[PDB]
Design a protein around this ligand. Sequence first.
Ligand SMILES: Cn1nc(O)c(C[C@H](N)C(=O)O)n1
Ligand SMILES: Cn1nc(O)c(C[C@H](N)C(=O)O)n1
Ligand SMILES: [Cl-]
Ligand SMILES: [Cl-]
Ligand SMILES: [Cl-]
Ligand SMILES: [Li+]
Ligand SMILES: [Li+]
Lengths: 263, 264
Amino acid sequence: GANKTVVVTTILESPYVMMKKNHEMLEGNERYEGYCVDLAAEIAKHCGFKYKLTIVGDGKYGARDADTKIWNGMVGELVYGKADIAIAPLTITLVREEVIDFSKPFMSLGISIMIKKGTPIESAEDLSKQTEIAYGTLDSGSTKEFFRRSKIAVFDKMWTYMRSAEPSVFVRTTAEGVARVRKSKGKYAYLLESTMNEYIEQRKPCDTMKVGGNLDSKGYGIATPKGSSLGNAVNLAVLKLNEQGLLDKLKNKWWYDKGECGS
Amino acid sequence: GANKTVVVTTILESPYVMMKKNHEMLEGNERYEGYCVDLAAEIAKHCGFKYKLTIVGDGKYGARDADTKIWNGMVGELVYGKADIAIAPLTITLVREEVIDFSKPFMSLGISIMIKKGTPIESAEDLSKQTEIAYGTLDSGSTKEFFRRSKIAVFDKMWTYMRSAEPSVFVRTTAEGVARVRKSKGKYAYLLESTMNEYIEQRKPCDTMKVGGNLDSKGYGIATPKGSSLGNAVNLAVLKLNEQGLLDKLKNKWWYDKGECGSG
Ligand SMILES: Cn1nc(O)c(C[C@H](N)C(=O)O)n1
Ligand SMILES: Cn1nc(O)c(C[C@H](N)C(=O)O)n1
Ligand SMILES: [Cl-]
Ligand SMILES: [Cl-]
Ligand SMILES: [Cl-]
Ligand SMILES: [Li+]
Ligand SMILES: [Li+]
């Protein structure tokens, strides 16, 4: 049939998608700026489609309810036919790969630890061996699932603590996790992907840092409904953009050229 | 060959696939050891197939000959139907993705610089701005194509030099590039993926090192012929093995530092 505007699901998560200055009087895609706004424009150009950015209704990345088996987040919007493509920092995982299609990675990353500067923690092992400093993860995504499923002793011990900690150590949005680190006087550390950890380390008031090595090695992919004809062209576009240096340029633009914590 | 046996193409490249000691009295898959030998056994177990390891006939990763337009290397073995799967440090690239299928990555890496210790080079930019120290890449693979196609000023400058350097700065095998660094008294640097660079830096004679950051961010994938029924299960197996920690365990085994250089 005739060309139709592609519905892009994405998530309001800095620096991937942010409200532009003057958004209150702007419409459509012009309301937004950021790494995934730029990436969406590049993918659409290389693939020959028009598109509308739409922020995921529930603000989640995507997980499957263990009881109902219903998917939420951006994954659910693809699974249930509400969006045509997700262009976001959506981690490629086994349980998601089983229900949606993914491009090859457009970013490489791993789970990491964010501390308030001066916190006496250097590693996940350190966190697991003490109780004075609380720690947690984002809800409804791949980091929480990593700990829930891990059979590695250190990560198992961490999950056993996190799942029963009171008050809850889990947060609904990345920003809430950052705030809890910044306000907790060193008594909360946040488990989040290295990409975001590195971004926040370059934002005022420059009071957080990444410690330890990454816990795993994975990637973000552009996602489509399973079997969508759109997947092939999108994947070729990701590989071309990576090989041309454009993805490295975009990361540098939004992470380091715009950094607030000096040169 | 025997029915129901998956033919695996792979490449003799340490520590991915190596001949075992006393391999001459061994037979079949038992001749070989290494990271990709272990990975093949894990993938085959998860996917439920029997398999035969074969070393790629021409010893190449895979490129399309510009004149004949025929694919060589492991890519060619898949394209022309001589193998059912490639399990090797085969880089996921655009031109390869157009002709074969790839799993999600099982290893993440980038192009890097190997020098003989003491060489006054810290970066690709450093290489591009001088002519005393020669430098080159492997033939018939993704690193040479990266420079050939790049429009980044530094990399374009490097390609313009490399393509016309005499004698040739390109080598037929990774080992030959490493040997050239070691024998050239600091007057040759070698452009190769970080995985191998890091492996060699920890091994005797302890005379090479990696300098600078990686030039790109890429991955190795398990490859199958386009549309093969094997691709789906193989991809799910790679993701499961990564999530169980087994890929990191295999890396830590085959990159294990026994202290050949320094204290270990
Ligand atoms: C920074 N950061 N940390 C996380 O856990 C996430 C979400 C993840 N990318 C997903 O897809 O669930 N993002
Ligand atoms: C160490 N190292 N450097 C390279 O260039 C290679 C080959 C590459 N993985 C390909 O697929 O062509 N391997
Ligand atoms: Cl429309
Ligand atoms: Cl022998
Ligand atoms: Cl440039
Ligand atoms: Li999938
Ligand atoms: Li492909």
